[PDB]
Design a protein around this ligand. Structure first.
Ligand SMILES: NC(=O)c1ccc[n+]([C@@H]2O[C@H](COP(=O)([O-])OP(=O)(O)OC[C@H]3O[C@@H](n4cnc5c(N)ncnc54)[C@H](O)[C@@H]3O)[C@@H](O)[C@H]2O)c1
Ligand SMILES: NC(=O)c1ccc[n+]([C@@H]2O[C@H](COP(=O)([O-])OP(=O)(O)OC[C@H]3O[C@@H](n4cnc5c(N)ncnc54)[C@H](O)[C@@H]3O)[C@@H](O)[C@H]2O)c1
Ligand SMILES: NC(=O)c1ccc[n+]([C@@H]2O[C@H](COP(=O)([O-])OP(=O)(O)OC[C@H]3O[C@@H](n4cnc5c(N)ncnc54)[C@H](O)[C@@H]3O)[C@@H](O)[C@H]2O)c1
Ligand SMILES: NC(=O)c1ccc[n+]([C@@H]2O[C@H](COP(=O)([O-])OP(=O)(O)OC[C@H]3O[C@@H](n4cnc5c(N)ncnc54)[C@H](O)[C@@H]3O)[C@@H](O)[C@H]2O)c1
Lengths: 336, 336, 336, 336
């Protein structure tokens, strides 16, 4: 009678993942943990959003501070610093979305089992937890795996696209660039960012080069592409929605129309919901709220010849990924 | 005798105060402390600036992990979290600029004296250290005082303006609004800010109201105006430069031209260098690099009648204030 | 018996007025005129919107040049340059919304009568056309008047609020400042703006002072406030939603709480739908899509004393105003 | 022997080309024509600049209705819309910089000859006028040619880089993406752009795909690369400075250091002043004011293998190109 989940962290991803859950027919958000945000503040951060509008699918109210009330449905609020000490079981949380960004290691993420959780989905890349991307390798998941990663929003955009191109034409080698919206790790004015100097510069007033592991990660969820793709990123002054610029040399000659038709078929086929196809004069804000992992922009791309082409795919880095987090949990729950 | 100074907190103000000092002929930066910026990283943060251009007055290089080197002149660097552990004396710093934003209390600021500093200038309002605004009340400083506040950039903008208006026409009551550039305390995307919820919302994508005691503070540096002013602020999507919007009722009736003439005369005389006067169609970016504390915009303001008007004054919140920090030190150094 | 209307000029206001109309059970959009945008292009500009989202209420298709289909309801498309040649009567448009901005003079707006339109509502201030603001003086409208002005968005925000404060406490004098979103008359980079030099400077990279007659205009819809209000504006880098900052001196002493309760009551009574009331820590994006003309922000304002206060009220300059254009038409149609 | 030049079109390029000329020792600006800017307004537009700061090299005063006076140097101001009518010879303008963007056709730019100018340099690509890029093919120019094109800023950034990579390793094929700053042709809010629908969308609130022939154009100035390059662009929310992202398959295997070394050598030799070389963590604003045509960012790019790599080169789309316009002129004067 519904998949019970808990969310650790309540940032951009934790909050939007909660929105998706609270509005679904099959998943139940039973608890959220966040040591830094009072119960009162939590309701405010959840209700109002600069990018995705006011939550209006249900009204919000405080039952008693250890408790939230979303349209008569309860949601426990924990304020526990040690994951190892979150009583997920007391709330009935089967799955836990680890979305804080500091427990991405399998052994650190594993802490949630201590409190009675049975499954943990890391909402970010992981060095040792298996990564799964819907539409790409989610079928590789098996019930004995308790800690998994849903990879990154960028890998979720690149992988489906690369799979379609590789399966149809054979990818020899490819280089990728993402023109990315700013994020929470960036700064409003030039500030300290010791692990990424460029990343400390005023975010909304600069084009900021940045490294990316999304292309390399593709090789993990699609071994056949390991070592054949790499890339980088440019952080630009936008609040949300990013775009993937994939330049690849393919083995089988294909006209631009053939490539377009392949992506189109896939988007109408088994990858519906994951890959989208568009042929209109759209821009970034037209994709805010789009739940797909990768929306191919047919008119934006360009081919030099039948074996070397540049492909463009949009992605609401916040909302698409958030839906995939729930999508991954759904697949896991259906796997005996 | 060259005034020797140290800086605690190498941020927007710390770094710019460094630029003013390094370009002067009377002040010598001898050391800098910031546990979040290694020596190497410091050369990069000081050299490149999103708003104030590249440093091109002298070369910037590292002598060793503990000393910089600005065109041959040595500047020692520390990485200490607790002020009372900073050996200011060893470096010969007589004056210490407290610009971290977390040690504004007098007793927290006085930690610097333990290490051998003789004077501390807090680059922000202080709860108990006396506040001074150059051109308004710096002459109240007495040498028995070791810890002082240079107030806020906003008070530095409004106070000189109010002084001229009060001395010439007599202020009965006033209400101020500052349309303010974003700062380091804000967030790139909707994030937590437990003590200022609005302040946590995506900075460059919202007009964000905020309270400020900067107007009320004018009453502290000009007691005659106690209880006569207050106001608020709107943080808007710009990287630097803000503006004061003062709606005031005056006792002696005066035409707008009479008010303009009073300010122009003040800018050319007693308050030259503090209050500036312009009569052109300028906009925020035109004031980047302006060293004055308050630049009156003749054409922007409007009078309802001879005793009720709206006055407009610009200020490069980063640069003007940074210069006033040095000016305050110059004045204290000349005292006695 | 729907109210049939036509729209001249398919811009920010024209398109959004069309959205309000198309969503109503009230009025029927029967025709649109714009010689600067093809019929096919028109469907694109109407469908996608950077700030108000994609139109998904009904399907959008082209029937045959000159004819759009929003679901199963036809909308005639004109491409006439001269207003006196638009055969509004052919499409059956009784009311014409003059939203081009270049035909605000009463004589120039009268051209629509030539084509058979019965009434014209200028979606802008007019030098001589009778001005009406809903919730303020729309009851002054008489059926013998065929050309009216719906004022500006700023006056629709300021006037209702002012009426509430004046009737309860008596406004002696006030000065208004509006922190305003950028608009179509502004420029992306420094360019030519002959009648407004500041307004030619890069829009999203500057705080830009501007003159406004919105405060003075209040005197036309509220005689007792004529000559008692004036102000100016600051255009800031946001795409939509602006805020009014009203500093007023009142006759009757009143605590800030009394002022608040007065506005809340009004927002709950006759002025419901025109004046809004909020007391949460909201920011501009939180008001995107708000249909009210003026949303009083309880927590943002501040009082110096019981007779001198600063009040702040938000307004989606695009959406609220567009709804008011339809509300005025609704009132005119219900008038003897 | 001062090279006397005139400028048609006092926009971003015209005004900055003006600044270069006026700060030079070998070029003399003797006349400017722009019927959309009065002599008085012209002084304001030239003096203040959102991106490049206030003009300070010289005073700027008005010597009657036509002549401006810059540091005692008189400059005649014309206000004529039809090129065929500008009396260049009267001012002594030998070379005319055609920077209006509406006379790029050889035949149309030729109009300046009837007025007495002897040479015309089009500050934009031309469909038929011969194009030249300094450091790449300006030596192909011959005195019998009176109308030339300085191509586009993007081609000026990509061409030098392509030349180096091609001369050193051999370019088999390449695909380019430019992350470009907004420009004068874009819109502040969703407005009409019939020839480029995406380009009509709010410029500073969207990532906007854009077509470009800049890469294909490298084939015109570098015949060996004809048909070997193409690409596209993404317009993003910055005021100035853009970047080229070149993905290339090369013939001679070369490690990234060998490539970095080749470019660095070029930047210190034959292409000094044209190609720059950086090895620091820079961001867009760090390049404002850089006069090079293409500045290679060693750390931003990445290599997949010794024959497939992604190269990054910055360019101040306004300043770099403006300097090149003058350089093309200097070359033409020296090869007369
Ligand atoms: N578009 C995106 O933002 C995006 C896309 C894909 C993946 N992600 C992933 O999600 C993470 C980023 O979230 P951010 O926007 O993107 O969201 P935020 O919006 O950065 O998340 C903020 C929340 O994390 C909470 N938090 C911090 N420490 C905590 C702790 N110890 N326990 C509980 N809660 C804690 C904070 O209080 C805050 O409410 C990243 O690690 C990234 O891998 C983000
Ligand atoms: N325009 C302005 O930003 C402006 C104007 C007037 C006054 N101020 C005042 O300046 C502050 C100055 O902040 P910035 O200077 O604006 O913000 P920053 O730019 O956020 O200050 C940055 C630096 O303080 C350093 N720091 C933090 N903790 C420290 C510690 N324990 N020891 C040493 N260094 C430490 C940080 O590492 C960082 O480098 C505030 O308190 C404010 O009221 C700022
Ligand atoms: N926030 C706001 O933008 C706002 C608020 C209140 C009132 N208004 C009013 O609406 C008008 C401004 O609209 P703008 O954004 O604000 O919208 P735009 O978005 O400026 O309107 C643009 C359209 O007007 C069309 N147009 C021009 N000349 C025409 C003609 N002769 N015939 C038919 N169509 C023509 C153009 O082609 C274009 O499509 C102003 O006059 C103002 O009074 C605007
Ligand atoms: N960064 C850049 O913007 C950049 C870089 C390289 C090349 N370019 C190129 O040059 C234009 C550069 O134009 P800009 O951005 O400098 O222009 P702006 O900045 O749009 O140019 C503006 C001026 O041209 C003037 N003008 C228009 N019509 C005229 C006429 N008939 N006679 C005289 N003056 C007239 C206008 O008044 C306006 O002041 C383009 O054609 C483009 O290809 C631009």
């Amino acid at each position: 009678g519904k998949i019970k989940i808990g969310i650790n962290g309540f940032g951009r991803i934790g909050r939007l993942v909660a929105r998706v859950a609270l509005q679904s027919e099959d998943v139940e958000l039973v608890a959220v943990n966040d040591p830094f945000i009072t119960t009162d503040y939590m309701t405010y951060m959840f209700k109002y959003d600069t990018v995705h509008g006011q939550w209006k699918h249900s009204d919000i109210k405080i039952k008693d501070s250890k408790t939230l009330l979303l349209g008569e449905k309860p949601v426990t609020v924990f304020g526990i610093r040690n994951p190892d000490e979150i009583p997920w079981a007391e709330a009935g949380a089967e799955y836990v979305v680890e979305s804080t960004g500091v427990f991405t290691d399998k052994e650190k993420a594993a802490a949630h089992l201590k409190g009675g959780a049975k499954k943990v989905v890391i909402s970010a890349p992981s060095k040792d937890a298996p990564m799964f991307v819907c539409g790409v390798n989610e079928d590789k998941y098996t019930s004995d795996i308790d800690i998994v990663s849903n990879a990154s929003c960028t890998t979720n955009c690149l992988a489906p696209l690369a799979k379609v191109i590789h399966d149809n034409f054979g990818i020899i080698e490819g280089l990728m660039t993402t023109v990315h919206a700013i994020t929470a790790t960036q700064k409003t004015v030039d500030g300290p960012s010791s692990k990424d100097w460029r990343g400390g510069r005023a975010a909304s007033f600069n084009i900021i080069p940045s490294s990316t592991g999304a292309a390399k990660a593709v090789g993990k969820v699609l071994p056949d592409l390991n070592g054949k793709l790499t890339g980088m990123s440019f952080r630009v002054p936008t609040v949300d929605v990013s775009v993937v610029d994939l330049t690849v040399r393919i083995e089988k000659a294909a006209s631009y129309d053939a490539i377009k038709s392949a992506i189109k078929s896939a988007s109408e086929g088994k990858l519906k919901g994951i890959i989208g196809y568009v042929e209109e004069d759209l821009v970034s804000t037209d994709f805010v709220g789009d739940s797909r992992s990768s929306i191919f922009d047919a008119k934006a791309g360009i081919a030099l010849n039948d074996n070397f082409v540049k492909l463009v795919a949009w992605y609401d880095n916040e909302w698409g990924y958030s839906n995939r987090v729930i999508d991954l949990i759904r697949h896991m729950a259906k796997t005996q």
